[PDB]
């Protein structure tokens, strides 16, 4: 629920082996990234970290925030928040993405490399309709509730 | 170390900056000193 | 680096134009202190004593005493980091729009970047001094669409726990309505210790034009503002009491003290506009560049301000 | 829900009055406290704070702790509780108490009994009487100045 | 009349003094936010299509391709800026997402917003969605604070 773990660790890290240590829930961004991309950022309203954003309205007096949603009103998606200041950077449908993102936990088991994702109601990729997003991995589990993937995001579909 | 020093040589982006964070409390310090508020 | 760089070159030449910040009229020399910090907070501590019951007779023999407990409050100041991105000409591209009585293309709205920087700077330290009065961030003349602020970031016209009076939209015109709220709200200030202060009042102008009638079978010699400047001068121990007058207010009266001990204003030391070093090029003469700003840094004791609203129907 | 309120206070206190200044959540301990009173302190089992609390057992593994709640299971009266060893400060039933306690969401003199939430509440078998008025310090908690004294009889 | 700069002179200064509300004016090109990593192409420009969506026009074939005012499913991009000297309209591909003012047909944020025949944005294919209520700076002109994310049904 946070992108660093709220309770301190009391361990220390083996800094020895080099190969399945990036499936953490802090690593930001994507893995390949481009130095020709637009990035945003906005309001955040609730944690829409690793998750599909859309804009959120309000009475009119404060200005427009991005909270975690898909759908027919999928906006972009949340790739890092700055918990300070309560900033989400946004990457627009728009512009291509390759990282992991949140999935639904339900039938995670099903999801295999080459399936094709579409975002829920609460910005977590689901199996399949309007979102070319593709599965490049299986599902890492986390956490007894949060699973995430690899997945790339290259805008939407008729 | 402030703009208004025109012995002043900025080296780099980061002096020149703080010369600029000087500067500008040089001329509040100025400004108050100046100041005559109206009373009455 | 000025051989180097032109812009920073431009920029040091430049700066002398900009006039001050009319918030420096608010606050007294020593109220004002800077500090080194560009994003993030400050915290401090304050220690308070109370009294939870009546005290205990010391008469034969006693066990159970009265006590007197403590209590502890942290105060936190956030502090924000924004910018501002404007396009301008290219350096070498000015010959070539230079004109007989003008630099630029006025067909295009197209400056050079001297001019851009000056007239950029000046807009946002008029919008620095709207959020230090005021409280909030918004472009808009209705004041909505308010950026989203971080909490403990506040006015002088927002600040909490500060004694508020309105006036009723009936007596919007009738200046005794009005002065007798004020009186309300001056009874209620708790200065306590300090109280032989300098004391600042800030009025909009609507209210200002009010005040210089004569006082009311009007009276000789007295003005409803020297009335007012003698009122005030009742609880700082006859001290100097100033009238500004700011057109950002409306229909709004502010007075509070000018001692640092109870409102003390710690700016960043890089709240006032400054150049970015990041210039975007390209092979048209068209560049941009970034100024940044820091907000935040007020702080006051609670009831210590009074804030008049003078409702208009 | 917190001793201490987590969020910080944007402005400094006003501290030239001396009246009326005790109405607050973080008062720990008592008005009339005697140097003869007996204190312990317990494992906590939730926010017993200000609270009626009780013994709670769990599977043997680890030791007993308290938790708020009344009835026929009052053991204490929880008056204070460390946030970082999560010790709840316990004057037992059997020594008398008055202080500033949850009240249920009054006046002086009314007969008072903890319920299933360690809450007071008004009127059985707990000899409790409230002193004052419900102060409301949130639009959910409420606080009463309140003397207990032992346990009545049924 | 609907050029961009107006061509009659002002008979008075403007007074500089107020910060508030002085954006909302057809001379503001561009958007309102803008990234230094955005794709803008100029084209010739066939009418005057600025602050509209346009449309790939062809000829016969002795002339280049130029750009006019549309919409609907034959929507190429939008015009953001033009050069009356040289008729050259800058346009920002459907692909790349904009934000600023748009001209509106003659309305809550929120609302969803597809363009028409004739490049003026209308209520409800979806191609960008509403910021701010219309503004009217004409009897006829009404622009719109609007953010396009390309092409949805």
């Known amino acids: 629920l946070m992108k660093n773990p709220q309770q301190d660790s009391g361990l220390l890290s083996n800094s020895i082996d080099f190969r399945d240590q990036n499936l953490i829930f802090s690593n930001s961004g994507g893995v390949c990234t481009s130095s020709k991309d637009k990035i945003e950022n906005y309001p955040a309203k609730g944690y829409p970290y690793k998750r599909g954003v859309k804009l959120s309205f309000g009475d009119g007096t404060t200005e427009l925030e991005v909270e975690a949603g898909g759908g027919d009103d999928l906006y972009g998606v949340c790739s890092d928040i700055d918990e300070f200041s309560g900033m989400a950077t946004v990457i627009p449908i728009t512009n291509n993405f390759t990282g992991y993102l949140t999935l639904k936990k339900d039938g995670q088991n099903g999801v295999n490399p080459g399936d094709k994702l579409n975002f829920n109601q609460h910005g977590e990729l689901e199996k399949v309709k309007s979102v070319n997003a593709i599965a490049l991995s299986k599902a890492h589990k986390l956490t007894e509730d949060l699973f995430i993937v690899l997945a790339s995001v290259f805008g939407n579909r008729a | ?40 | 680096l000025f051989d180097e760089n032109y812009y920073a070159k431009a920029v040091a030449n430049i700066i002398g134009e900009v006039k001050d910040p009319i918030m420096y009229k608010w606050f007294s020399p020593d109220q004002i202190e800077d500090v080194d910090l560009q994003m993030g907070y400050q915290k401090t501590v304050k220690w308070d004593a109370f009294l939870n019951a009546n005290p205990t007779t010391i008469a034969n023999e006693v066990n159970t005493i009265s006590t007197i407990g403590f209590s502890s409050e942290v105060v936190r100041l956030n502090y924000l980091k924004l910018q501002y991105k404007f396009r301008h000409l290219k350096q070498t591209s000015e010959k070539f729009y230079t004109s007989d009585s003008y630099i630029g293309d006025i067909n295009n709205n197209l400056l050079p970047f001297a001019q851009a920087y000056k007239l950029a700077s000046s807009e946002i330290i008029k919008l620095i001094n709207h959020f230090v009065l005021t409280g909030t961030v918004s472009i808009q003349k209705d004041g909505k669409n308010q950026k989203r602020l971080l909490p403990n970031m506040y006015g002088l016209l927002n600040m909490p726990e500060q004694i508020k009076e309105e006036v009723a939209s009936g007596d919007k015109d009738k200046m005794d309505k009005i002065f007798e709220k004020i009186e309300a709200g001056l009874s209620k200030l708790e200065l306590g210790d300090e109280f032989s202060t300098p004391m600042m009042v800030i009025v909009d102008p609507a209210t200002s034009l009010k005040l210089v009638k004569p006082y009311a079978a009007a009276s000789s010699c007295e003005k409803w503002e020297d009335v007012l400047i003698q009122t005030i001068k009742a609880i700082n121990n006859r001290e100097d009491v100033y009238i500004e007058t700011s057109n950002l207010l409306k229909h709004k009266i502010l007075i509070y003290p000018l001692n640092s001990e109870l409102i003390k204003f710690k700016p960043s030391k890089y709240m006032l506009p400054t150049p970015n070093e990041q210039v975007d090029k390209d092979s048209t003469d068209v560049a941009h560049s970034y100024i940044d700003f820091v907000l935040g840094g007020l702080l006051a004791t609670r009831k210590t301000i009074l804030q008049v609203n003078i409702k208009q129907s």
């Open chain 2, 1 to 40: 170390a402030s703009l208004l020093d025109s012995n002043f040589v900025p080296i780099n982006f980061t002096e020149f900056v703080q010369a600029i964070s000087n500067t500008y409390k040089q001329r509040r310090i100025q400004f108050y000193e100046n100041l005559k508020r109206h009373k009455r």
